[PDB]
Ligand binder design. Structure first.
Ligand SMILES: C[C@H](CO)C(=O)OP(=O)(O)OC[C@H]1O[C@@H](n2cnc3c(N)ncnc32)[C@H](O)[C@@H]1O
Ligand SMILES: C[C@H](CO)C(=O)OP(=O)(O)OC[C@H]1O[C@@H](n2cnc3c(N)ncnc32)[C@H](O)[C@@H]1O
Lengths: 474, 474
C-alpha cells in the first residue's frame, strides 16, 4: 500500500514533522487512488471488528443478535448491509448495565488516561494510546489547514467534559505549535481574550462558529478591531456555521482571515475526521483512513449515491478504547466524490453538515432545518447577529415564528427603518423556505450570545401560543 | 550523590513508575542527608545561573546592576546575599520591553509548547522540556500524597490562563492515574460535577479549598452526600485554607477524606514544590531538589532561622524556559527543619502560607491576615460558611468590620439565637485578634461563593463608612 505508519493498533512516530514545503502530512494516505485506499480500509475494518469481537461483549451481543460475525465482512457492501448501526441510546444502556464506560471499553481499566463525556450523559474512558492516535490525527488535519509548527493556536472552547477543546489542543501540541488553551465558559473571559488576541496576535483560532461571532462583538465593545489579531485562520466544530453561506462570510470579513469547517462527534474523537483543507476550503473532506465515514439512507443504513443526502455513519480505524463501529450520527449531509482543489482523494461534504435530523421541524408540509433560517438571516445587511425560532411539536404549525434582532444602525435609523427590516426579513425567509414567516423584532443585543453551541429553537407550546397571539394582536 | 535523574537540563524517563510498596517516588533525592542535598543544590544553582547569564539579557542586566556574576556563587550564603531578588513588577516591565515573554524566556521561540499567564498580566511561554519536567515533578509529589496509577483524579479548577489546573492534570497524566479534567468556571458546572463524583467515585480531587466548601453545599442542595464520593484525598492550591485549622477540619469532615496543602506560584510551576505528604499531612514540605525555597527576612532578602517567619523566595532547578531565580513571593510563612513523619529530609512550612503580605491590614496597631479571621470563624459551630471583611487603607481603623453568615439552623432557631451567634462571633474574633470586632449578620447563602480564589476583603472607603454608620445606628 505504501500508507504511512499503517498498523493496528496504531503507534505513531512522535518526532515526525513533514517537510516545510509539503502540503500533506501523509502524502500517500491523503492522495493515493481511492480504490487502493478502500481495499486497505476494508482490511482495517476486519482487524477492528475482530478486535471488538474479542474485547467488547457489547459488540459481541449486538452482532450476534443481527446475525453477524467478523468473518462475514468480505467487502464494504457487506459492512453496510450486515453490521448493525450503534445508536447513542445503546451506549447509554451499556454504561448503565456496565458502569462507568460500558461493555465497549475494550482496554483494561489500567490503560484509561483521560475521562471526559457528554452533558443520560455518557462517560468517555480514553486510553493513553488513543489519546496519541487523536493528537497525531489532529496535527495532520491542522497541517492540512495550513497551520504550522511555531504558530500560536488559540483554543477558545470550554475545557471540561467537552471533547472539542481537548481535541484541538492535542493536535496543536503534536503539530509543535505554540498551544494557547485560553478556554471558555466563565463570565469575564471574552473581554480578557480580545486583549490577549490583540497582544499575542495568533495565527489560528479554534472554537464554535457562534463564539467567533460573539467575540467580534466583544472586541468592538472593548474598542479593539478583530482584523488586527493577526489571524490567518479560524477552525470550528460543534455545530453548523463554518459551511453556512452568510455565517462563513461574516466571520471571514470580521477577522480578515480564512474559516475552516471540521467535526463529527465527541464519541468519534479524532473528530476532525471530517474537515476542510486550505485549498478545498468549502465544506469538509472525509479523511477515510482515520475514520471510515458512510453517508447512509436512514431507512436502511446503506450508503446513498454521491450527489445525494443522507446520515453520516462512522467507524474508528485507529482506536482500541471505546471503539465506535458504525455509530449512527443522526445528522444530515450531502456527499460528493469529485476532484478536490488540494488534490486529496477523499469524498467531500461540500456544504458541511446541515444539522441533527431531530432538530428539523415541519411547517405546512415543508421540512426546515434551523441552519436554513440562520443562512437566510445572515445574508441580510440589516440583521443584528441573533434570532430565536419559536415552535411547537405538540401540534401542526401553519406559519414560522421568528424573534429577530435588527442591527444597531437599523435601530438608530428609526421606526420606519425597523418596520422595513422586519417586513424584508419576513419576505426573504418566505422566499427561501416557501412558507409564511411571522417576524417579531427584539431590541439589539437583547438575545443571549454563547461561547458554546447556539440553541436558537424554543420548542415550548406555551411560548409558541403566547407569541402567535401577541403577533396576531399587533 | 546517587540522586535519581539528576542533570541540567533535566530529561526524565517517561516509563518509570516506583515499586507499588514504595512511599517515595525518588527515595534518594527525597530522604538523603540535607547537607548532602544542599551541596548538589549549590552545584545546580551554579549551572542555572550560568545558563541564565548566557540566554537571558534580563538576568544579565539585573545581576550586573547588583554587582553579581555566576562565578561569585561559592555557597548558599553567597546566593542569598549577592543575588538580587526578582519582583513580579520586573517580569511585567521585561514583557512590556521584550514582548510577549520578556528577556528571561531563554529558550528559542520555536521551543514554546504552551501559553498561559496571570489575570498588567504576564504571559507564560513554557517549553516542551519544562512541561515534561513539571509533569514528572507533580506525579512524584502526588505519589507522596498516596495517589497511585489507575486512581481517578478529578481536576476541578478552571482550565484557562491559570497554571493550577494544568499543573495537577500534567501530574495525573504522568502518574498514569485516570485524569478527569472536569474544570470549573461556567454556570451549571457544580450541579453537574456532584452527579459525576457520585457516579465515578474518584480517589482524589484537586481545586481551591474555597471550591471544596462550595461543592459540599452544592452536593447537599442536590440531595447527594459528599462522603459517598469515594474520596481518599483532596489536594488544594491557589490560596490559604488547606493548612487553616477550622477550614481543613470542615473539608475533611464533609468528604470523610484527607486534605493536602500544596502550591507556591504560577511563575514557579512545578508549583507543588511546596506540598504536604500522606504522613507529614499538616502543612507543606519544601521539595528543595525541584525548586530551591528560601524563607527570607523582607528587610534584607536573607534566610531567617528555622522557627521564624519570613517571605518565600524561590529558584527553579529544572527549568530552561522563563527560569525564576530568587523570585520574591511577597507571601508570609514560618519554616522549621525538624524530623518529618514521612521521613523526607526537607524543611517544612508546618502552618502552610498565611497569605500575601500586601493583603494584611492593621487595626489599632495590630497586624491582621484575612486567614486568621477565616480560621476563628470556621472553628465556630454556628458559622454559615461565608463572610466579608470591610476595611479602609485610606485612613486608620479603630475596629474590625465583619459581615458574617450564620448557619441555616442558627437562623431557623429565631431572633435571639441569631443575636447570640452575632455577639459570640464578635467576642471570639476579639479574643483571637486582641481587637474590637463589629459583626453584621447577613442572610444564610446570600454571600457569593467561588470555584476559584475567595476575595473576602472589601477595601472600599465608601463601603467601610456606610457599614460603620449602619452598625452605629442599629
Ligand atoms: C467534540 C465534537 C466536535 O466538536 C462535538 O461537538 O461532539 P458533540 O457530541 O458535542 O456534538 C456532535 C453533534 O454536533 C454537531 N456538529 C459538530 N460539528 C459540526 C459541524 N462541523 N457541522 C455541523 N454540525 C456539527 C452534529 O449535530 C454532531 O452530531
Ligand atoms: C498556580 C499557582 C498554584 O495554584 C497559583 O495559585 O499561582 P498564582 O499566581 O495564581 O497565585 C500565587 C499566590 O496564591 C497564594 N497561594 C497559592 N497557593 C497557596 C497555598 N497553598 N497556601 C497559601 N497561599 C497560596 C499565594 O499568595 C501565592 O503567592
Amino acid at each position: 500500500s505504501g500508507m504511512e505508519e499503517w498498523n493496528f493498533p496504531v503507534e505513531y512516530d512522535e518526532n515526525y514533522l513533514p517537510p516545510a514545503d509539503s502540503r500533506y502530512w501523509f502524502p500517500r494516505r491523503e492522495t493515493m487512488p481511492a480504490a487502493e485506499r478502500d481495499k486497505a480500509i476494508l482490511g482495517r475494518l476486519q482487524q477492528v471488528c475482530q478486535y471488538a469481537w474479542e474485547h467488547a461483549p457489547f459488540y459481541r451481543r449486538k452482532w450476534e443478535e443481527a446475525g453477524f460475525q467478523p468473518s462475514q465482512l468480505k467487502s464494504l457492501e457487506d459492512f453496510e448491509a450486515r453490521v448493525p448501526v450503534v445508536k447513542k441510546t445503546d451506549l447509554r444502556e451499556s454504561q448503565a448495565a456496565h458502569p462507568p464506560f460500558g461493555d465497549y471499553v475494550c482496554v483494561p481499566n489500567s490503560e484509561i488516561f483521560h475521562v471526559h463525556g457528554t452533558s443520560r450523559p455518557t462517560a468517555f474512558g480514553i486510553g493513553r494510546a488513543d489519546w496519541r492516535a487523536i493528537a497525531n490525527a489532529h496535527a495532520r488535519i491542522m497541517w492540512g489547514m495550513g497551520i504550522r509548527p511555531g504558530d500560536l493556536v488559540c483554543v477558545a472552547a470550554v475545557f471540561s467534559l467537552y471533547m472539542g477543546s481537548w481535541g484541538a489542543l492535542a493536535g496543536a501540541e503534536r503539530l509543535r505549535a505554540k498551544a494557547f488553551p485560553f478556554g471558555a465558559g466563565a463570565p469575564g473571559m471574552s473581554a480578557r481574550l480580545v486583549q490577549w488576541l490583540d497582544t499575542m496576535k495568533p495565527a489560528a483560532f479554534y472554537g464554535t462558529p457562534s463564539y467567533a461571532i460573539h467575540l467580534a462583538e466583544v472586541a468592538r465593545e472593548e474598542k479593539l478591531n478583530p482584523r488586527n489579531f493577526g489571524l490567518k485562520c479560524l477552525f470550528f466544530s460543534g455545530e453548523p456555521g463554518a459551511s453556512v453561506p452568510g455565517v462563513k462570510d461574516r466571520i471571514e470579513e470580521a477577522y480578515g482571515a480564512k474559516v475552516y469547517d471540521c467535526g463529527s462527534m465527541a464519541e468519534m474523537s479524532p473528530f476532525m475526521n471530517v474537515a476542510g483543507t486550505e485549498q478545498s476550503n468549502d465544506g469538509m473532506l472525509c479523511w477515510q483512513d482515520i475514520i471510515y465515514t458512510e453517508v447512509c439512507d436512514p431507512a436502511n443504513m446503506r450508503r446513498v449515491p454521491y450527489g445525494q443526502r443522507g446520515t453520516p455513519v462512522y467507524t474508528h480505524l485507529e482506536r482500541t478504547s471505546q471503539p465506535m463501529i458504525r455509530l449512527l450520527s443522526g445528522d444530515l449531509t450531502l456527499w460528493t466524490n469529485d476532484e478536490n482543489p488540494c488534490g486529496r482523494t477523499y469524498p467531500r461534504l461540500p456544504q458541511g453538515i446541515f444539522g441533527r435530523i431531530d432538530d428539523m421541524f415541519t411547517i405546512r408540509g415543508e421540512n426546515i432545518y434551523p441552519s436554513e433560517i440562520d443562512a437566510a438571516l445572515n445574508q441580510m445587511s440589516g440583521y443584528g447577529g441573533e434570532h430565536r425560532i419559536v415552535i411547537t411539536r405538540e401540534s401542526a404549525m401553519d406559519e414560522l415564528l421568528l424573534r429577530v434582532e435588527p442591527s444597531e444602525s437599523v435601530h438608530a435609523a428609526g421606526a420606519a427603518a425597523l418596520e422595513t427590516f422586519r417586513t424584508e426579513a419576513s419576505h426573504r425567509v418566505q422566499t427561501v423556505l416557501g412558507v409564511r414567516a411571522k417576524v417579531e423584532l427584539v431590541a439589539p443585543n437583547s438575545i443571549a450570545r454563547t461561547d458554546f453551541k447556539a440553541r436558537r429553537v424554543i420548542d415550548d407550546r406555551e411560548v409558541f401560543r403566547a407569541l402567535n397571539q401577541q403577533l396576531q394582536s399587533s
